[PDB]
Design a protein around this ligand. Structure first.
Ligand SMILES: C#Cc1c(F)ccc2cc(O)cc(-c3ncc4c(N5C[C@H]6CC[C@@H](C5)N6C(=O)[C@@H]5OC(=O)C5(C)C)nc(OC[C@@]56CCCN5C[C@H](F)C6)nc4c3F)c12
Ligand SMILES: Nc1nc2c(ncn2[C@@H]2O[C@H](COP(=O)(O)OP(=O)(O)O)[C@@H](O)[C@H]2O)c(=O)[nH]1
Ligand SMILES: [Mg+2]
Length: 169
């Protein structure tokens, strides 16, 4: 059975843990310990293929050891998450994209840009800004809400499809 190692990255408070728990448990968790980094498995069928998705929900004090670089290098695909109500989280996307490219040593790593919290009315990052950033990286952009589940399956399944495309190159 094919396993896909997915890693969820992005600034604190964007909803990385809430997205992960909405995917694995179909529930919205209002409080998930901000400091805790952990991984979960979900078996799903995507385009007819039975998948094992191993999701790593990143967290913890900012550190850059050789061991952390090797841990992040295990990822096959990355969800780069910002929150639509937080301009700084969107501005930080470049940093996360560059750390992925740094440890993978490649200009072609499967990634999806995720604009989370789309259920909130206070949007400070318009869709056009994020669509432009994603087109500049050659990756898909998807808006999600971990609260309502809008776009959640689409974000993770689109990242699996990017990994499949990459393996065919
Ligand atoms: C990811 C990642 C990553 C990759 F995607 C690929 C290879 C990596 C290889 C590496 O070795 C390391 C990392 C890595 N690990 C942690 C990171 C991290 N955390 C983790 C999360 C998110 C913010 C805060 C601190 N968090 C928390 O969970 C905190 O724990 C809490 O509780 C919070 C207070 C919520 N912060 C940042 O950057 C934050 C900024 C803002 C301040 C300066 N810094 C520089 C820019 F400006 C942006 N970068 C990080 C980083 F690159 C790698
Ligand atoms: N309204 C709403 N709140 C969310 C959503 N995702 C996360 N949150 C909330 O935002 C805060 C941070 O979420 P969390 O998953 O801990 O962010 P992380 O630090 O990226 O893991 C919590 O209070 C969550 O309930 C969402 O899509 N909509
Ligand atoms: Mg978290």
């Amino acid at each position: 059975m094919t396993e896909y190692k997915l890693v969820v990255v992005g600034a604190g408070g964007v909803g990385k843990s809430a997205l992960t728990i909405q995917l694995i448990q179909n529930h919205f968790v209002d409080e998930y310990d901000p400091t805790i980094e952990d991984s979960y498995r979900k078996q799903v069928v995507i385009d007819g293929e039975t998948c094992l998705l191993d999701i790593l929900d990143t967290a913890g004090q900012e550190e850059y050891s050789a061991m952390r670089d090797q841990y992040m290098r295990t990822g096959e695909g990355f969800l780069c998450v910002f929150a639509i109500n937080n301009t700084k989280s969107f501005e930080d996307i470049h940093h996360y994209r560059e750390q992925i490219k740094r440890v993978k040593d490649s200009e072609d790593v499967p990634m999806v840009l995720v604009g989370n919290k789309c259920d909130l009315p206070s949007r400070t990052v318009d869709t056009k800004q994020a669509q432009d950033l994603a087109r500049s990286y050659g990756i898909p952009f998807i808006e999600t809400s971990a609260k309502t589940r809008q776009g959640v399956d689409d974000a993770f399944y689109t990242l699996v499809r990017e990994i499949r495309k990459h393996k065919e190159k």
